[PDB]
Structures are given as C-alpha cells and as structure tokens.
C-alpha cells in the first residue's frame, strides 16, 4: 500500500520560514512525479508545486513562485517544501500527492501564518 506522512507544519509569523517533509512508502518513489497541494478554510484546494521523479523538473503555482522550493531525496524516499516569506494567505493543510493528484490521501500538516 502507498503511505505518505507529512510533518513540519506549525504556527508561525509572516516573514518566517518552514520546511515540510513527506515520508513516502510502498512504491518506487524515484519513478514517480510528486506534488504538494493545500486546503485553506473556505477556499477550493490549491495545487502548490510538482517535481519530476529525478528532481530535474520543477513546477509552481504563481501564488508561491519565488518563495517556495520543492525538492526530494530519493535515497530517503522523502519530499520537501522549503516555504520562505510566509504570508497569512499561505495558511492551509499541506499534503503531498503522487503525480499531480488533487485529492488528500494523507493526514497532511497544518500551517497557520498569524498576522
């Protein structure tokens, strides 16, 4: 079975940074493009970032361009999101998904950015 476990969320001030981790198990991690998606309260889900299986190709939503960096460690089967200059608008549950799936298949991790 595929298992995805997110951590690194927290309650943080605007302008602070957070690094999220996604521990992936039950598949050849390196063969699969991976994604971060977020669910803010009272908003549609929002695709954030995708990374090719190699780590060579990278995509971002305009809402996070220049602030967030996606990366992966194939050896540790782990996906990362480096989130800098965080904003109130960034408040959401962050979840990693395989290959651009929009549906949450994991506990996720809460990020609250408080004015």
């Amino acid at each position: 079975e595929v298992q995805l476990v997110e951590s690194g969320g927290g309650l943080v001030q605007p302008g602070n940074s957070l690094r999220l981790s996604c521990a992936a198990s039950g598949f050849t991690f390196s063969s699969f493009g991976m994604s971060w998606v977020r669910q803010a309260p009272g908003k549609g889900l929002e695709w954030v970032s995708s990374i090719s299986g190699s780590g060579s190709d990278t995509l971002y939503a305009d809402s996070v361009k220049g602030r967030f960096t996606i990366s992966r460690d194939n050896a540790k089967t782990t996906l990362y999101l480096q989130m800098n200059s965080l904003r109130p608008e960034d408040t959401a549950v962050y979840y990693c998904t395989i290959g651009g799936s929009l549906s949450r298949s994991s506990q996720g991790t809460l990020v609250t950015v408080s004015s």
């Binding site: 079975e1 598949f27 995708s50 190709d57 395989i98």
Partner: protein, 573 residues
Amino acid sequence: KSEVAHRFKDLGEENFKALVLIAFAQYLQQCPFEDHVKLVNEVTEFAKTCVADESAENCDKSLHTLFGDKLCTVAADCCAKQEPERNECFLQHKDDNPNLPRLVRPEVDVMCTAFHDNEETFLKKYLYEIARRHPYFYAPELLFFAKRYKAAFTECCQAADKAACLLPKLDELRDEGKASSAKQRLKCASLQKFGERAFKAWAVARLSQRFPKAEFAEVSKLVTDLTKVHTECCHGDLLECADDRADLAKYICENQDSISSKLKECCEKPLLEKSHCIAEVENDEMPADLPSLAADFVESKDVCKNYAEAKDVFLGMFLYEYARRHPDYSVVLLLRLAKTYETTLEKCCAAADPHECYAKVFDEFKPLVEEPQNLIKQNCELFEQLGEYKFQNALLVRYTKKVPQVSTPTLVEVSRNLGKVGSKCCKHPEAKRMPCAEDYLSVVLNQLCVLHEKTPVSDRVTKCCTESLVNRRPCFSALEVDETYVPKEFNAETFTFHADICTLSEKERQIKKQTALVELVKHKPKATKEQLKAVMDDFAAFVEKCCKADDKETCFAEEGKKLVAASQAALGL
C-alpha cells in the same frame, strides 16, 4: 500425505490411468506403446496401495519423483539428474516435430473389428499416438477427444454404410485436434518463454470479452485459477492440471449469476463435455451503455497514484475495461493497447506533470487499431480474388522473400496454415473478423517460431519470435524482402516429376507445386510476381497434360526440360 493417492481419488482410476499414459507419451515420444502401458499399470497398482494405506512406503513422495523413477527404468542425460532438475530436463527435450512413422488408417472394416476385439487397447493407442505426436496437447481435452473418438466407432460400426458414418467424423476430430494442439502450444510458449504475467494478461483480455457482465474481481479470480491450470499442464503436472480444471468448471457452474448468462446448457453436461463447452462458450451480451474509458484512464489526475497502489491491478482494470467493450478486437490487439498504455505510464508517471504527457494516449491507439483492420480487409480481398490455394501461393512467395533461410517444408506448412485464415475468417461480418483472423495468425506464427527454435537459422524469425509475444504478427508483417540473402543453387529435380504424381491427392499435388515455388524463389529472390505466375501456370499446365498421356514418365521428363529451359529463358540459369 500421499499426493498420488489424492489425485487417484480425485480423478478416479480411468482418468488417472489415461492421464499417466499421456504424461509418459509426451516425455518419451520414441518409446513403444507396450512399454508405456506397463509403466502406467505399475504406477497405477502402486497408487492403489497408497489409496488403501497413506503411510505405506514411498506414498509420501512427490509425483515427479514417482513418475520420473518409472520413466528412467526405460530411458537419458535427464535420468542422471535429480528433482527438480530432472523434470526440467524432460520438459526441455519435448520434440515438436518427432521423426515418427506417418500414421495411416486401415480400411473401416479392419478398424471397426479392432474396436470390437480390443476396445480398451484401441482407445489407449489413440491417446498414445496423439500425445507422442503432440507433446503439448492439453491433457484434459485429450480425454474428451478420446470420449468422442469412442462414440464415433460405437455409432458408425453398427451403421448400414460404416465408412460413410465414420470417415467424416474421424476427419472432423483430426482437424479439431490440430486446432486444439496449435492453441495449447501457444499457451505453453507464453508461460515458458514470456512468464505467468504474459499469460495472465492474455486471460484477462479473453475472459473480459467472454464474460463482460462479470465484475473485475470475478474475472481476476478466474484468471488466477485458469493460469494455475495451464502452468501445471505446460509443466507436465497433468494429474493436478485435470483436477484443478474440473474444480474451475465446478466453481464457474456454481456461480453462473456472477459470470455469464450463456453457461446454463454447458453446466448440465457430464464433466468432460461441460469443461469443453465452458471453454468454447459464446461471448455474453455487453452491459448496455458502458461509459468512455477516457475519464478514469487519461483525463483523471489520479492515474499515477492509482498506478502506484498496484501496477498490475490498475493495468488489469484498464485491460478488463477495454476488452469487455470490444468483442470485435483481437486479444493480441487489446494486449498491444494495454502494453502501449503501460509504457505511457512508465514514461509519464515520472514527469513533474504526468497528466500533460499521458493526455493524448488514446491518439496512439488509432493507428494500432487501423493496421490490423487494413491487413484483414486487404488479405480478404486477395483471398476472394485468388481462392485458398492461390492465396497460399501468394503468402508462400511473400514469406520465402521475408525469411529465405527457413527450411522449405517449414515455409510450405506455415504458409498453407497462414492461407487457411481466408476461408475460416473472411466469411464473418467485420465485427467478428479481427479476433477470428488475427488470433488465428498468432497461433500459426507460433508454429513457425517453435519449428525454427531448435536450429534458428533466420535471425529475423528469432527477433520477431523473442522480442514481444503480442507484436509477433505486426513484426512479421513489417519484414521487408531480405536483400542480404545469397541465392541457393537450383536442383533440376525441382521441376522433374514422375507418373505416380497423377495418383496423389489434390492436396499432395499442391504441396509438390508449392515446394517447387519456394525452391524457385530461394534461387531467384528478385523474380517478379508476374514471372513466378508464368512459371507456376506452365507447371500446372504440364502436370495436367502429362497425367492425361499414355507414356506419362516420358511426358514429365521432356516437359521438365522444357520448363527448366523456359525458366532459365525468363529469369536465368
């Protein structure tokens, strides 16, 4: 405890005894009938000691141990080896083309008398002769052929005109035996050369076409059980194959509501009739208005997540979904589409944006669907113009030019079999033509691959046979004329026939002319269809004229020299 006792109990003395005879005949094909009958009797008396007392010595042994030990009392390299290597050695030595006496049937009076005088010996000789000629014959269906071979003699030996009753039935059984044998030979080549995944994929496609109202989970269960049946039969595990086949027929008939509406009459019949009936049953009606596959397989952004959970189950579901909707497609076509889909997910699921690169995969299917459709259309039109015999000649020339290193008898046999597609498929409506034509062609090209395997002289036959089971037909179709082949020398004897040619059947005279045509092409591979048609028309004309003459031997001699002369005139020495 005792496996031999278990099987003996499960199948009963008669089918146990028939199945051991078949096993021994398939392993030692050159061994005399009398010698096999003795080995079977010995093993059978033993099995009964094991039935009566399970702890009796050597009843705890594996079937392979017991059966190989008995075989080894009469056998060569393989008897020096030990289980499991011994069984593998026996399997490896099965001969697809044994050098055996071509089997002739006596007068109907002789045969009917033999049947009355020695019924059991007469039916055991049938099993023995079929099994040693066809070492991959599906053992449980061979039990059924024997049952029908008995009913033929029982009826027809009472009849007013025996020969009129009996001969058309022995001809139907003989013809259906060769079809059953060729089909089983392809199942075994799939398991042994391409592995259980290859066969499972074949089974998912075929059962999904037949049982389209069945749930995926039902179809998977049947695929599991059917794969186990053919793995055992193709590995020489014949007692457990027949046992497990009887159990699958039982399961299917007890779950008709989960599987098909067409099983009712099959599931009334006795065990051997029922198994055969189920295996050949018509495709059920499709559930009405099934949706497009695009939504869950190409437009969904969940394709790679779903792939990731279970690659083979997700690809299984795709094949099941595609196959149940297309009774009008060949099984090899459906396997080519699924294999395309799979290679698309392997590339695409590693992309930052998998949806972007797999979104047009159904575009890739269009040419894959059209190519077989255009091949059948094109070859059925030629068939309608030429008729069977001349259609065979067209395919002979085509294949001799593709793979001229192949043996003449192999080219003639395979090309004749290729040409029978016309009569067996081209009469069907275009909704039945593709599975009829293309799955039949897969069976015949497997015959080419196995006749060529022992001494693989044609690199291009080896490539087409080994690269991809499911691409075999397209691979052969795409082969160009071989420009590299060095022409062989022409023996004059090729066109020099004798008087007794007039006494042969129409079929034998055609084979003689087809043999000569191959020998021509191998000598003059640049020869035009028009030039080969002239030569072949003169050949026909010379045999008709010479078979009418008073001095036939003279006529053939002279006309041979004329034909060679005319030949060399048109195409050269």
